[PDB]
Design an enzyme around this catalytic site. Structure first.
Site, mmCIF file in Angstrom:
data_model
loop_
_atom_site.group_PDB
_atom_site.id
_atom_site.type_symbol
_atom_site.label_atom_id
_atom_site.label_comp_id
_atom_site.label_asym_id
_atom_site.label_seq_id
_atom_site.Cartn_x
_atom_site.Cartn_y
_atom_site.Cartn_z
ATOM 1 N N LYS A 216 -4.286 -0.686 -8.010
ATOM 2 C CA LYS A 216 -5.512 0.081 -7.907
ATOM 3 C C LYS A 216 -5.258 1.337 -7.101
ATOM 4 O O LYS A 216 -4.349 1.383 -6.277
ATOM 5 C CB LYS A 216 -6.594 -0.744 -7.210
ATOM 6 N N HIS B 64 0.880 -1.153 0.000
ATOM 7 C CA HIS B 64 0.000 0.000 0.000
ATOM 8 C C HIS B 64 0.920 1.205 0.000
ATOM 9 O O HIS B 64 2.068 1.125 0.433
ATOM 10 C CB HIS B 64 -0.882 0.055 1.246
#
Length: 215
Positions: free
Chosen positions: A110, A80
């Site tokens: 994403k 992340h």
């Protein structure tokens, strides 16, 4: 031998092999959408070989390579990137050249669509980018060269964000990261949950993949 077991059995060897490899170069894609363009993906759009869409079920804009570069089965390793919420568009522009690179080791990623957010503080105030990593070999094992390319890529993302003056966001308590990573964090979704805790973090720090990315 499972992906994880293979890393555990050959940790020090892989670690030493990675140390001898040269700088990884990532050709930066120039014709790439900016953050606003990403949100324009809708049901289907293509850019640099990556299929794009943002049509609805979740709060993210998705990107997936049409012709994958990793042939193994996903083994749970993912990262992340956390930045200040209002800096997401700037951070995206700073990283798009690498994210769409024909040399990137990430076939799927994403980014949160800030306009679709409800009350998901976890992926809005932090963890706005998600990078999926999967073993490169058909037999689902990681090769030392790919691990090196992946670590180099992650370190490149860190450098790019700092060089662009981006400020860190809220790191998800579900993830772990060394002191030198100011934006990146890690977790294995096969062996951890999205709900953080000291127990989980202590467990994640022993993941051999994580150790190879940091030690």
């Amino acid at each position: 031998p499972s992906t994880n077991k293979h890393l555990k059995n050959n940790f020090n060897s892989l670690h030493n092999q990675m140390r001898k490899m040269p700088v990884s170069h990532f050709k930066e894609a120039l014709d790439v959408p900016d953050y606003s363009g990403m949100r324009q993906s809708g049901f289907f759009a293509m850019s640099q070989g990556f299929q794009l869409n943002n049509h609805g079920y979740d709060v993210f804009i998705h990107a997936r390579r049409e012709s994958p570069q990793s042939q193994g089965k996903f083994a749970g390793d993912k990262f992340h990137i956390s930045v200040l919420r209002d800096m997401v568009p700037q951070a995206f522009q700073a990283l798009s050249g690498l994210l769409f690179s024909e040399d990137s080791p990430v076939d799927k990623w994403k980014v949160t669509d800030m306009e679709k957010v409800v009350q998901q503080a976890r992926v809005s105030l932090g963890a706005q980018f998600t990078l999926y990593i999967k073993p490169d070999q058909e037999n689902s094992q990681y090769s030392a060269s790919f691990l090196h390319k992946t670590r180099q890529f992650i370190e490149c993302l860190e450098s790019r964000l700092s060089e662009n003056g981006v400020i860190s966001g809220q790191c998800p308590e579900s993830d772990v990261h060394p002191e030198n990573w100011k934006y990146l964090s890690y977790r294995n979704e096969l062996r951890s949950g999205r709900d953080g805790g000291e127990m989980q973090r202590q467990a994640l720090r022993e993941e051999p993949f994580y150790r190879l990315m940091t030690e």
